[PDB]
């Protein structure tokens, strides 16, 4: 009893686009083969859906959405957490009124607006603020590195709140992401965990910092680490090929 | 030499839907009496396009996207102005930073994400964080009619900013607006004032408090306050008629 997952953009597609018939023929195949599939990304399912296209449902056995915070099984929801639930609005409010002093706090050159955006399973923290020009985006990826302002909020939020048992990890240029410890793609496992002997994990950040990392490194996974969705069939077909 | 003015959605259309085939009958036969149609919406062009089609910009002789701070004219920018480029970035953080001080002190029970929204034309400022549910949605606006939360910060920013010359106009139920006095509407007029013995203004929100009430009042337009599109046509088929 087998199950191959994958993380989706980059390993099931090119960075950023479409899956390929090609893709979708090296999975039919897998399936065809006794496998079961599955796929996991930060993502929310609507990005996913325009990844995969329309029927993503009814092609794989499994679908993680927000790292497994909702989740589809045999093309049926079963599973959906929130930030809000697990926390409570309390324990939100409080981690959100500080982070917003903080930023108002801040002396950097450039604000915009968007500075602390709540989603299901996540915060994603600003302190340019992600209302912001591309350009805006570069000045100021620059500036952090000089000068840790992410580092340095990130230190002050863990001391302030260490009873919220919660992880932060640094997003792309302008922002980063606070969630509870635990809810990295890692989530998904407590679900497939006791069905399959074995489960594979294909990805391509697998490097610490990365996002699959924490869920390649796992013990119960067999994890993969791919450069682009090409290797990703290589990988299929060989372990079709026996 | 007269053009016509419309409001976007409610007026055009119904209210947040696409055009009828009726009512663009209904501006062409307008355009081909002589009139020059023109369109003023504090909604960006994308919205605008998504209401009356791809084809927009050719069957409009002006488009006034954000109230005019973006506008096209026989299909063809003309104008570009923004928030940034009038305040100035310090001028800008200072605002905003403010802000995020204000709200991150209120003593309010549900808070989200996205509290400060910086846009083209206007700051979009939310209390409560327009992250939020719709049901969120209506207890926070059932909370701000008893304790008029919106309306504090407002004195509030007021105060804090006089030589701003900015105006502050309440949104929908979790958000109000600041922008520069001046950029309702009524911007849009400095560009057609010189062209036209009459301008008409339809529109549907010119009620006082109202996004039409400024330029609908204006004395250099022809107010025409509408309820549906469908007045709209009659209006126009009586201005044809003659
Ligand atoms: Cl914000
Ligand atoms: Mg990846
Ligand atoms: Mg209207």
Redesign the interface.
Known sequence: KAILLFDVDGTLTPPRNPETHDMKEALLKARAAGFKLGVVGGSDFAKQKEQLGESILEDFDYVFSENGLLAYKDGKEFHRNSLLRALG?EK??AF???C??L???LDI???????????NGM??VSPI?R??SQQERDEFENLDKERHIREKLIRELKEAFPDYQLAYSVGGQISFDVFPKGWDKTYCLQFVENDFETIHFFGDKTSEGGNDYEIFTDSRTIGHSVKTYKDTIAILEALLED
Chains 1, 2 share one sequence.
Do not use: M, S, W, Y
Not at 109 to 119: D, L, N, S
């Open positions: 609005n939100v409010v959100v009124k500080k917003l002093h930023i108002a706090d050159p450039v604000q915009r607006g968007t500075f602390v955006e709540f989603r915060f994603n603020g209302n912001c």
